Amino acid sequence: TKPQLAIVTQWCEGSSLYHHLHIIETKFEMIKLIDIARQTAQGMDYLHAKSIIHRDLKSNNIFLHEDLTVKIGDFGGSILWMAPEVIRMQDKNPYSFQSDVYAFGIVLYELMTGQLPYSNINNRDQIIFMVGRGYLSPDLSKVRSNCPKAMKRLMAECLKKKRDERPLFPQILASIELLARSLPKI
Amino acid sequence: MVDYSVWDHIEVSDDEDETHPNIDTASLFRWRHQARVERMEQFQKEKEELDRGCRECKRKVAECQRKLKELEVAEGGKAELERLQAEAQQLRKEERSWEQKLEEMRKKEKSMPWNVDTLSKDGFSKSMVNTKPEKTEEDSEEVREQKHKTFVEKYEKQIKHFGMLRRWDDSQKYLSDNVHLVCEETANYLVIWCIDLEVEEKCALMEQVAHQTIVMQFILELAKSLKVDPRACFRQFFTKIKTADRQYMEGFNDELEAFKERVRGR
Amino acid sequence: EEVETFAFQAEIAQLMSLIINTFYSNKEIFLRELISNASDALDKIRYESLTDPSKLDSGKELKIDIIPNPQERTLTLVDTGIGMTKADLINNLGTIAKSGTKAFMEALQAGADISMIGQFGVGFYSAYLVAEKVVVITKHNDDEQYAWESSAGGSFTVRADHGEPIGRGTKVILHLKEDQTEYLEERRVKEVVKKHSQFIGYPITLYLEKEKEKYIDQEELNKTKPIWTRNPDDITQEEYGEFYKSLTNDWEDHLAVKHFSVEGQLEFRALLFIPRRAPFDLFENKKKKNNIKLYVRRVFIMDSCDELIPEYLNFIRGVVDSEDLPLNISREMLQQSKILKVIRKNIVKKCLELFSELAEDKENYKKFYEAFSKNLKLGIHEDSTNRRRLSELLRYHTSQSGDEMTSLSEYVSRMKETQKSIYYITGESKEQVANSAFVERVRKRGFEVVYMTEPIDEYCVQQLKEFDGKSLVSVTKEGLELPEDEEEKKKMEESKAKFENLCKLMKEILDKKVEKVTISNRLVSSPCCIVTSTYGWTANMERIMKAQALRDNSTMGYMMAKKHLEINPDHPIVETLRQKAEADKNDKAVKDLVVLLFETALLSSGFSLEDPQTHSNRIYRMIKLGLGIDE
Amino acid sequence: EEVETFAFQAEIAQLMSLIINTFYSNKEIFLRELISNASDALDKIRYESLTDPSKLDSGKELKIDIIPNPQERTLTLVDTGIGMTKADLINNLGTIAKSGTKAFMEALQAGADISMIGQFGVGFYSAYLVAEKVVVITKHNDDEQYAWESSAGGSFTVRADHGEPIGRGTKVILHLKEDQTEYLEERRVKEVVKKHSQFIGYPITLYLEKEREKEKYIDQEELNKTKPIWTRNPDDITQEEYGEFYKSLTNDWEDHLAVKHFSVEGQLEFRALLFIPRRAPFDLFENKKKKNNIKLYVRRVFIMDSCDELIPEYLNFIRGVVDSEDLPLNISREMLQQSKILKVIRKNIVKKCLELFSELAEDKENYKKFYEAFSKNLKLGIHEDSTNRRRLSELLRYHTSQSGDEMTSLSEYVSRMKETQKSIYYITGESKEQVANSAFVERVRKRGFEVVYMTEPIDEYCVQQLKEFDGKSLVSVTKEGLELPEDEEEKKKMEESKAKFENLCKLMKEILDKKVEKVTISNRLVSSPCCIVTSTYGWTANMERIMKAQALRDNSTMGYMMAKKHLEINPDHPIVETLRQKAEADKNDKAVKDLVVLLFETALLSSGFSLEDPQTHSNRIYRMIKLGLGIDE
Ligand SMILES: Nc1ncnc2c1ncn2[C@@H]1O[C@H](COP(=O)(O)OP(=O)(O)OP(=O)(O)O)[C@@H](O)[C@H]1O
Ligand SMILES: Nc1ncnc2c1ncn2[C@@H]1O[C@H](COP(=O)(O)OP(=O)(O)OP(=O)(O)O)[C@@H](O)[C@H]1O
């Protein structure tokens, strides 16, 4: 004789983004692959404007929430997101904003290629030494058929050789937004 | 006057009203806390370094004063004296620079804000548990008789003052101090009061007093169903009967009519 | 080359209009302002008395009256304070932004037992929010009696008068408006006075007219003195309880109490409380929360529990009185909102210490736990800072303690030598889970399982992942491993090859549904059971999620987990099933038996069947066959 | 006797101290105030040129500029407006509570056609909140260039200045202090301008210094580019403009679905603009999120966006703007006073939003998309709202027993019922397959009647309140005492059959032992031996399941008041007839007990309820499997 009222929920841990692209297929269209790449760029810009660094952004750290909402976090081999300066052994402080930029670039490569980087050689010690000296890099030919050219320029810029000729995040965000609001199909 | 310039630089590490829709909080708090602790420890290293350097420099200054007193009787040491004078003067001027740096550093640790553990330091604190014997209920028949006589007489005067009215909010506050005071014996005397009002054949007074009495007895019967005393259950039925729905209103009306017929036939 | 200086001026008419029509929101705070002024005057005369008693020969008591009159529209507010002289009357009551209290405080020695309200200046002009003409009558010790009259225009008249003597106080006569004649009704006056100014140290009284028609003197406007100001070594239990009854309208008393106070730059004094039984509309929200108030010099400022305590500690009542803070022009809000978040930390810390102290005696903890247990598990879900201190007040039923709840740290004591990790199970009732298929093996080797039988337990156990370096492992998730002997391992390895053929055939009959069928070691006396996979929902969580009213559905398929089947290689039924499958490749009886076995396994492992009519028909056919009826 | 008249006065230093640091929070506000002073100035020169030109020989265009200087810690706010003379630099900027806008509006001949911000006269000292030294340089059409300068506290200097040519306008220079030196950057200024004042009618520009390859200066006028649309006439706008505004007001990669645009020219004046998102946001049913859907705007200046009562709870997806012209406002321009007009605004908005909902229900292609996403929010209006229930129940579209994959409506279903029928039949279940071939709807679907399906929790929450339609009552097919109007020959046959199945009733009630409160015989089944129905007053099965499953229950009270149930059997099935024949002879046998327990348990299983202890039933099934295969023992 005294009804009720519907009650709201709290939240839940949505699926990780490494599950979507590596253990399942979950292939989206080209437009949505753009929107996710923009969301991770904006969020890292906010952290980088208060002197907070992250030290790693493994693709499983990214949590593709309900509907579509990217949320970087920290909860945690991972020698595939590291910079050619992290694997050094001097001064115990190689970390800077450019290393975050490099990790973001590798995330972008995984995101539009659809495959794990360095699929050719399978030896951890060999890979770490090779990145050390006689350095290599992922081959850029492995791309989607309809992938644009504006970002292929952005990817090559994020990981060149060194920490002095790498961009900062406002330029990357501006480039991604410019490419985003120009793309019906290509 | 009215200067509020001191409360301008407070800092909290777990603030929830500044976040980004692309960072999950949770881990943001840990980052902020770690940065604050690291900065505090760096400044503490600097301040303790300056303090211990000043202490050892004062000890060495006392030692140099003792050496000067010794040389007041002795002779020969000039190059050492000149080197000590030059080094000590340069060290003292750079220490004055460092002291001014610390004096500005206090103003900066005002600009770099107060944290939680600089604003206040604790005083006294006490805590009790109230281990009371929560079991108190006197014999049913004796309480019935004594409450009947005393409480039923006094609150019968009260209920005779109250029953000639029909208001709800007045009835609400009257039941508030009733559940402060009254018990089931007052309810039984209200029942017999309605019963002997039936014999007196006051139709409109029957309608009003029966309205109030059936509301109270519905409180009573809900109490019987839940075994929770009428003292403890007054606000919920009142707030659901003042905002009673149409279906609840017609149910209440039909139950009122049924109870009126039952009492008239009783 | 002709720089010339000037001085800042002020325009008066716009200033007054702006003040009295813009500063404040409500129209009910004028009573608060007037009461504050009267309290200050009484404080002044009281302080001045205790050096020479020659200043109290005209009026010995200190009081405050309220006299309404609904025939002439007046709201007189007589008091017996210090009074004002002519020069002071002109210079403070007729000069905006100048206060006479600050001068008295500054000239007064250095440090005294005085603490007064008011330093701004624009406070008495708030009477013109609801008023048309105000009159003030005053008398001091060393002057005559004077009358002040104005109408919030641009002038005021001050004259000497003869009339009714007062001792030494001040009268404020208020001629009310035409559309605001609802402040001469007594329920409204009582509500305003009780909400705003009820801890003033002096006896406010009313002067109503009830029924000769008498003259009533109801003093009950405030008769509950503040108790947090005095020493904590002189309050004796019962004194607390009364203050609790007259604070929030209860018929019972409390169960615990804290009386702490911090010092430094930001200082306050708190009186937190814990109730006996939970209110039945605790999670109804909607209504503004008023369980913790905030006072400055014993005058209400603002109430809130959305920013002073977290959302899972809304059952605690108290008082947070302080001494000085950065207030607004209308003392109804606080600049620098970070002070509130600083206060919240100390409140939370003291509350947790109180809980830990109360959990010592194991006789009153049960009463607190059986009525306030959901809030703790709500806190574990969203509180990263203190989740280790809140994970030790958890009591669980366990299968080595009959009808008494045990603690989590007590569990880790009575473990075995080779045991790692804690075992748990989540169900819907305490007897549905006591005798299930999964438990029937680990409970035969002397191990322990805890019983988490409630809806919020899943929300808790999803976040708390380890305790004291031990891992929480469930009994229903794709291949738990428990310490065992080597010989058992060799025998199980042989049996795995023994049953390697029927296992594939069942996967053939059962299409997309199960995902892999395997031999298991978790059963001793049941044919088969269903387990889920590591990364995904469990059965109970799926059951809870499918019953939420306001939640979307387009993400259900992404989260659900697959299910495996466990064939136990000792029951006779499985032994004969292998016999049948060995000779015949496909017979109707084998198909029917496999389907029925899977269906009962689904029914007994917490899952909900998607078409009960088929199962019912299958049961009815067998009932018919074994008792006669042909068709 | 003697009467002395006086006049009021003030204390200047204390008043200034009150102004600076008592009724201004969120320091950033200062910038807004300064901008709101430039715009007004510009407006004046746009009004003196309408009657006659040749008051614009000094400047042609109107603009607002911002120049930050990171080296001397200054921030300039150049503006080419009307200007100020010498007699107005001492009577306007050197007197508390004195404005020049109000005196300007007084002299007009009630022609209106102008609207300027501010009438109180304290808004320069908000700019004083952040700086320690303020300098003003001004020029007018009939004076010489003059320079104001102050550092707070009973002083200001008004010397003459010959050091720079300014055509016509004003120039405000702030000397920042060491603590607050974050307003010289790009992000802070950009955010403050974009959030507080971006719909001002003039081109705010910025002059920051960049580096390219080298101190080359940059012109970033994009501080405001989107113009206010809601001031135009509704008929003269196209769809692409609306889409562009919606996109660059809440960032989203898709346009809108429907848009409303109205005005209210009564004693109260406001114009609104409401949209409808194409896809529902993910976190729209949370606890305490900072709601921001409808934003207020008094004269194109942001006031507040949270509000308590502007739209009711269930209308949350609606997003847009609401512009007014006059409201009771505080001294800080962030809070509303006495909150009475909000009721009128809320009523009007609700009415027009419902009008839009009804208008959209004509085409049969967009309504499917709207209803697939925002269906839940309509089934809250029937629950909470009580004066709009009648016209909110037409927009509900359910499945049915005659439409394969097509959602029909209640009004369509009313116009398809046969003459004899007098009520609507519905069934509340868990899924659509589980509800399609159940046992309750077996007689009503053989006569040829129509039942409506309802498979979701919010359907229970709504149906519990909606009890009528066109003066017809809804009756469920899973409750006690459901009557199908039919001829009394079969009713007499049922009465005759109600006498030979009498002893079995009391035998079954005795054996089940206070688990069922009645065991009657009834007419709702054709091919099923048993089915369990609940009482007429009390929770149904599925409602009880939903009540139990949810968290935060407070389950002390609910457990011991609900869940009444019955049982009913059919006199046609061979099982029941054989059972009656068998129990006729021996009233203390053994097989009958096992059989009745099995029947009751299976009927409980396939009717929505949940078993109390699932192990016993499974063991019984296993035992029968074992005995029907010859394992014995
Ligand atoms: N009833 C009164 N008795 C004595 N002095 C009074 C009385 N009412 C006002 N005053 C005088 O008025 C002056 C202050 O007036 P006003 O209320 O405007 O300022 P305030 O005390 O700072 O403000 P508030 O109302 O917040 O306390 C003081 O000089 C005080 O002595
Ligand atoms: N840039 C300007 N150009 C011309 N007149 C100005 C300028 N800035 C201020 N004024 C003048 O200063 C006087 C007082 O302005 P003040 O800031 O004190 O309040 P207001 O104009 O009433 O309000 P607000 O600043 O909120 O618009 C007015 O006469 C106004 O015209």
PDB file of N, CA and C and ligand atoms in Angstrom, chain D residues 33 36-38 40-41 44 79 82-84 92-93 98-101 117-124 170, ligand 2:
ATOM      1  N   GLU D  33      33.462  40.983 -16.254  1.00  0.00           N
ATOM      2  CA  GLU D  33      32.985  42.337 -16.002  1.00  0.00           C
ATOM      3  C   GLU D  33      33.580  43.308 -17.007  1.00  0.00           C
ATOM      4  N   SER D  36      32.006  43.021 -20.313  1.00  0.00           N
ATOM      5  CA  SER D  36      30.660  43.570 -20.274  1.00  0.00           C
ATOM      6  C   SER D  36      30.655  45.088 -20.232  1.00  0.00           C
ATOM      7  N   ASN D  37      31.794  45.716 -19.946  1.00  0.00           N
ATOM      8  CA  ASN D  37      31.889  47.164 -20.029  1.00  0.00           C
ATOM      9  C   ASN D  37      32.269  47.647 -21.416  1.00  0.00           C
ATOM     10  N   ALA D  38      33.024  46.856 -22.177  1.00  0.00           N
ATOM     11  CA  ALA D  38      33.358  47.268 -23.533  1.00  0.00           C
ATOM     12  C   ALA D  38      32.135  47.210 -24.435  1.00  0.00           C
ATOM     13  N   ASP D  40      28.879  47.337 -23.886  1.00  0.00           N
ATOM     14  CA  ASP D  40      27.967  48.445 -23.632  1.00  0.00           C
ATOM     15  C   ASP D  40      28.470  49.721 -24.289  1.00  0.00           C
ATOM     16  N   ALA D  41      29.748  50.046 -24.078  1.00  0.00           N
ATOM     17  CA  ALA D  41      30.310  51.248 -24.679  1.00  0.00           C
ATOM     18  C   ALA D  41      30.104  51.244 -26.184  1.00  0.00           C
ATOM     19  N   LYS D  44      26.687  52.259 -27.473  1.00  0.00           N
ATOM     20  CA  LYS D  44      26.361  53.678 -27.484  1.00  0.00           C
ATOM     21  C   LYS D  44      26.757  54.316 -28.808  1.00  0.00           C
ATOM     22  N   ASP D  79      39.820  48.700 -26.435  1.00  0.00           N
ATOM     23  CA  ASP D  79      38.442  48.734 -26.914  1.00  0.00           C
ATOM     24  C   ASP D  79      38.166  50.077 -27.575  1.00  0.00           C
ATOM     25  N   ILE D  82      32.808  54.406 -27.106  1.00  0.00           N
ATOM     26  CA  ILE D  82      32.364  55.796 -27.045  1.00  0.00           C
ATOM     27  C   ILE D  82      33.413  56.677 -26.380  1.00  0.00           C
ATOM     28  N   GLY D  83      34.049  56.190 -25.323  1.00  0.00           N
ATOM     29  CA  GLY D  83      35.039  56.955 -24.597  1.00  0.00           C
ATOM     30  C   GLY D  83      34.442  57.708 -23.419  1.00  0.00           C
ATOM     31  N   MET D  84      35.325  58.375 -22.679  1.00  0.00           N
ATOM     32  CA  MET D  84      34.939  59.121 -21.491  1.00  0.00           C
ATOM     33  C   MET D  84      35.688  60.444 -21.445  1.00  0.00           C
ATOM     34  N   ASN D  92      31.935  58.991 -12.485  1.00  0.00           N
ATOM     35  CA  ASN D  92      31.540  57.626 -12.797  1.00  0.00           C
ATOM     36  C   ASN D  92      32.498  56.587 -12.236  1.00  0.00           C
ATOM     37  N   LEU D  93      33.803  56.791 -12.389  1.00  0.00           N
ATOM     38  CA  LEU D  93      34.796  55.865 -11.863  1.00  0.00           C
ATOM     39  C   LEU D  93      35.323  56.273 -10.494  1.00  0.00           C
ATOM     40  N   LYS D  98      27.222  54.408  -8.668  1.00  0.00           N
ATOM     41  CA  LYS D  98      26.848  55.427  -9.650  1.00  0.00           C
ATOM     42  C   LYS D  98      27.196  54.906 -11.036  1.00  0.00           C
ATOM     43  N   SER D  99      26.195  54.797 -11.903  1.00  0.00           N
ATOM     44  CA  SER D  99      26.375  54.301 -13.259  1.00  0.00           C
ATOM     45  C   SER D  99      26.019  55.366 -14.287  1.00  0.00           C
ATOM     46  N   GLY D 100      26.526  55.171 -15.500  1.00  0.00           N
ATOM     47  CA  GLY D 100      26.210  56.052 -16.606  1.00  0.00           C
ATOM     48  C   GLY D 100      25.270  55.406 -17.600  1.00  0.00           C
ATOM     49  N   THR D 101      25.193  54.075 -17.565  1.00  0.00           N
ATOM     50  CA  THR D 101      24.246  53.362 -18.413  1.00  0.00           C
ATOM     51  C   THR D 101      22.809  53.712 -18.049  1.00  0.00           C
ATOM     52  N   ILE D 117      23.779  45.927 -20.361  1.00  0.00           N
ATOM     53  CA  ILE D 117      24.004  45.155 -19.144  1.00  0.00           C
ATOM     54  C   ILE D 117      24.456  46.084 -18.027  1.00  0.00           C
ATOM     55  N   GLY D 118      23.985  45.814 -16.816  1.00  0.00           N
ATOM     56  CA  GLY D 118      24.496  46.496 -15.645  1.00  0.00           C
ATOM     57  C   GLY D 118      23.764  47.767 -15.276  1.00  0.00           C
ATOM     58  N   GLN D 119      23.288  47.842 -14.032  1.00  0.00           N
ATOM     59  CA  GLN D 119      22.672  49.061 -13.528  1.00  0.00           C
ATOM     60  C   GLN D 119      23.021  49.351 -12.072  1.00  0.00           C
ATOM     61  N   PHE D 120      23.933  48.597 -11.458  1.00  0.00           N
ATOM     62  CA  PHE D 120      24.196  48.737 -10.031  1.00  0.00           C
ATOM     63  C   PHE D 120      25.373  49.643  -9.707  1.00  0.00           C
ATOM     64  N   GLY D 121      26.476  49.542 -10.439  1.00  0.00           N
ATOM     65  CA  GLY D 121      27.552  50.499 -10.296  1.00  0.00           C
ATOM     66  C   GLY D 121      28.759  50.055  -9.507  1.00  0.00           C
ATOM     67  N   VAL D 122      28.952  48.754  -9.302  1.00  0.00           N
ATOM     68  CA  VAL D 122      30.168  48.226  -8.686  1.00  0.00           C
ATOM     69  C   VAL D 122      30.635  47.049  -9.539  1.00  0.00           C
ATOM     70  N   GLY D 123      31.499  47.321 -10.516  1.00  0.00           N
ATOM     71  CA  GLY D 123      32.057  46.248 -11.316  1.00  0.00           C
ATOM     72  C   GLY D 123      33.471  46.452 -11.821  1.00  0.00           C
ATOM     73  N   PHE D 124      34.101  47.554 -11.433  1.00  0.00           N
ATOM     74  CA  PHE D 124      35.502  47.805 -11.741  1.00  0.00           C
ATOM     75  C   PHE D 124      36.417  47.229 -10.665  1.00  0.00           C
ATOM     76  N   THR D 170      39.116  53.385 -25.417  1.00  0.00           N
ATOM     77  CA  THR D 170      39.575  53.236 -24.045  1.00  0.00           C
ATOM     78  C   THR D 170      40.638  52.152 -24.012  1.00  0.00           C
TER      79      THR D 170
HETATM   80  N1  LIG E   2      35.543  50.882 -21.394  1.00  0.00           N
HETATM   81  C1  LIG E   2      34.655  51.798 -21.000  1.00  0.00           C
HETATM   82  N2  LIG E   2      34.266  52.740 -21.885  1.00  0.00           N
HETATM   83  C2  LIG E   2      33.377  53.657 -21.497  1.00  0.00           C
HETATM   84  N3  LIG E   2      32.782  53.795 -20.312  1.00  0.00           N
HETATM   85  C3  LIG E   2      33.186  52.851 -19.457  1.00  0.00           C
HETATM   86  C4  LIG E   2      34.097  51.840 -19.710  1.00  0.00           C
HETATM   87  N4  LIG E   2      34.272  51.044 -18.589  1.00  0.00           N
HETATM   88  C5  LIG E   2      33.478  51.586 -17.699  1.00  0.00           C
HETATM   89  N5  LIG E   2      32.790  52.679 -18.154  1.00  0.00           N
HETATM   90  C6  LIG E   2      31.839  53.493 -17.414  1.00  0.00           C
HETATM   91  O1  LIG E   2      32.081  53.326 -16.039  1.00  0.00           O
HETATM   92  C7  LIG E   2      30.874  53.680 -15.328  1.00  0.00           C
HETATM   93  C8  LIG E   2      30.675  52.745 -14.163  1.00  0.00           C
HETATM   94  O2  LIG E   2      31.026  51.404 -14.562  1.00  0.00           O
HETATM   95  P1  LIG E   2      31.065  50.226 -13.514  1.00  0.00           P
HETATM   96  O3  LIG E   2      31.972  49.143 -13.944  1.00  0.00           O
HETATM   97  O4  LIG E   2      31.388  50.821 -12.149  1.00  0.00           O
HETATM   98  O5  LIG E   2      29.564  49.738 -13.456  1.00  0.00           O
HETATM   99  P2  LIG E   2      28.384  49.479 -14.490  1.00  0.00           P
HETATM  100  O6  LIG E   2      28.801  50.095 -15.823  1.00  0.00           O
HETATM  101  O7  LIG E   2      27.082  49.929 -13.965  1.00  0.00           O
HETATM  102  O8  LIG E   2      28.450  47.908 -14.657  1.00  0.00           O
HETATM  103  P3  LIG E   2      29.282  46.800 -15.443  1.00  0.00           P
HETATM  104  O9  LIG E   2      30.739  47.056 -15.314  1.00  0.00           O
HETATM  105  O10 LIG E   2      28.844  45.474 -14.822  1.00  0.00           O
HETATM  106  O11 LIG E   2      28.762  46.876 -16.880  1.00  0.00           O
HETATM  107  C9  LIG E   2      29.742  53.698 -16.358  1.00  0.00           C
HETATM  108  O12 LIG E   2      29.301  55.030 -16.598  1.00  0.00           O
HETATM  109  C10 LIG E   2      30.384  53.088 -17.608  1.00  0.00           C
HETATM  110  O13 LIG E   2      29.863  53.654 -18.805  1.00  0.00           O
END
